[PDB]
């Protein structure tokens, strides 16, 4: 895996933010962040709650949302909207990429296409604008869901 | 002021839907407001327009309408942190959006080469492209000028 | 009072956001927004909680923290750091102002001095930078804590 | 690199503060101070760790945070916090200044404007209050980020 920051560094920043805000449940906040860091992959709140529940039965999805919102707000993690509410999360410390999203099964495929990246800048420059960031997702039926 | 469809045709279809699903007038007015508009409108502005003819209309009733219309594909939503939620008539040719991070200005575009390349890219995964959503966030020409 | 947005509009946006975040449907959460909106001061969570407990006597200050943290992330309210630990909150839909904060009593005085606002721009111009926003706090001993 | 005090003087005050607090001298803690003293910018804990690891590779960032927390609470260093730049640190032995921060590239520009400083005094005088301290940050698009690439 390629990450833009170390987990240790992320944890120290998290711990500082936690102390700063006087937040409780340091243990689970750290767990959620570590699960995403190690996965690289895009997980649903349900899959995250499932993941950390294995260690502590006290875990509720409501608590996880408070965690994911905290983590999202502090830019520790990134959120992907897959539906009207369907959402998935990944560690924020990854190289830029866009998303192919299978409507059927939910599979996420990362991509970064040089031609699209370049053309986007070209379009914007036609307006003498400066490209800061972009949000681009393609919704598909994946090859496996088509064979199904 | 182009559309893929006349307002009357859209309203025909609308009057169909409000029966299949179970204030047909106010729905039609909201659609009409958006159809006549050349911009993407917030719930607040839509409400304001409606209030001109129907004073004391609550924004909450407009939201309920917008949610139904969006659900049934009569209108589409553009949502960013900077600009909030804005709506437009669905009966327009496909386009994507540029949004200024500073002033919130929205610029519409549709680049044949980008659309083509998106199709080439998905073929690499032997997936079938159903739809996409593309937003570019920028500093616009006017915001950059001293 | 002067508000840049109606309470009903804010509440509709909140409800939209509740759904999108896939969160609970909360009266107390709308209650907190309402208290801050209607108030002409900057409130502590203790003050907000005292307001909330008029109806729900069992209300914990922890539930209030949880609400505040969500509203601030969604930009419905603004947080002012009065101390390393001290937090105060206000509705986001108010015209720009900066803060005078008494170190001894905690009194908050809003101000917007046209000269200060202009000088800030003049300063950034010296560096050929464009001013986007600013955060200015002045900590003082108010006239009443002085005389007393 | 205008400093209010020699590095050596600061490190001796540090030694005295360490003994007073019942702590143990460490070269690493002195190295954090020295890195910051030597720096012409504002450094993140990560960057400080990078520098320290040039001499001791197996240094942990948790140890640097602990050091930073002590140094800052005892006023050997100052911290600047923004969402955009996160927490960044500098040696405390510098003339008073406020901060400009670029929202795009995170660059920090220091400034000290006598007229602004005087105007703040005038303003609090309007309320018959006594100014004690202030925190002033301006967020900008800096000159370099505004440059067109076309
Ligand atoms: Zn991209
Ligand atoms: Zn699939
Ligand atoms: Zn991703
Ligand atoms: Zn497109
Ligand atoms: Zn603009
Ligand atoms: Zn549009
Ligand atoms: Zn101001
Ligand atoms: Zn006072
Ligand atoms: Zn205020
Ligand atoms: Zn100053
Ligand atoms: Zn910059
Ligand atoms: Zn500084």
Swiss-Prot record, chain D:
Its main location: cytoplasm. Zn(2+) binds at residues 42, 90, 99, 102, 105, 110. Keywords: Cytoplasm, DNA-binding, Iron, Metal-binding, Repressor, Transcription, Transcription regulation, Zinc. It holds the Pfam family FUR. It is found in: Cytoplasm. InterPro entries: FUR, Fur_C, WH-like_DNA-bd_sf, WH_DNA-bd_sf. Residues 1-93 are annotated as: DNA-binding. Gene3D superfamilies: 3.30.1490.190, Winged helix-like DNA-binding domain superfamily/Winged helix DNA-binding domain. One of its GO terms (molecular function) is DNA-binding transcription factor activity. One of its GO terms (cellular component) is cytosol. The keyword Transport does not apply. One of its GO terms (biological process) is negative regulation of DNA-templated transcription. Acts as a global negative controlling element, employing Fe(2+) as a cofactor to bind the operator of the repressed genes. Belongs to the Fur family. This is Ferric uptake regulation protein. It comes from Helicobacter pylori (strain ATCC 700392 / 26695) (Campylobacter pylori).
């Amino acid at each position: 895996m390629k990450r833009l920051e170390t987990l240790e560094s992320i944890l120290e920043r998290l711990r500082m933010s936690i102390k700063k805000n006087g937040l409780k449940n340091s243990k689970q906040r750290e767990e959620v962040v570590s699960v995403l860091y190690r996965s690289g992959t895009h997980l649903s709140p349900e899959e995250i709650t499932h993941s950390i529940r294995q260690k502590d039965k006290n875990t509720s999805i409501s608590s996880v949302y408070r965690i994911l919102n905290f983590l999202e707000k502090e830019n520790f993690i990134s959120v992907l909207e897959t539906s009207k509410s369907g959402r998935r999360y990944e560690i924020a410390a990854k190289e830029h990429h866009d998303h192919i999203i299978c409507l059927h099964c939910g599979k996420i495929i990362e991509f970064a296409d040089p031609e699209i990246e370049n053309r986007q800048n070209e379009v914007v420059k036609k307006y003498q604008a400066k490209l800061i960031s972009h949000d681009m997702k393609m919704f598909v039926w994946c090859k496996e869901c088509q064979e199904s």
